[PDB]
Amino acid sequence: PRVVRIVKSESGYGFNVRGQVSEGGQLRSINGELYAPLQHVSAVLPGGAADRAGVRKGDRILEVNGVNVEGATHKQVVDLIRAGEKELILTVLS
């Protein structure tokens, strides 16, 4: 787990999020710890805000803006990402 601050730029945050549309699901082991399903970063725009902040493709999103998103729907995670006008704090598992 690492915490990253991303500042929205003229290309947005510059990443794509991908994952389940439903809520809940089975536990999975990631790095020896158990988590319910996580959305993940499916693309990172080169030179965009997420890239500059150190976000990488494949990162699993554990928290958005301090809110745990295990088992969250895609919509819940997108809405949390969009909660701030400019600042985004992600906790990711690489």
């Binding site: 794509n16 991908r18 389940q20 549309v21 997108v78």
Partner: peptide, 7 residues
């Protein structure tokens, strides 16, 4: 059933 969104 997954979805992908650019942000």
């Amino acid at each position: 059933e997954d979805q992908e969104t650019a942000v």
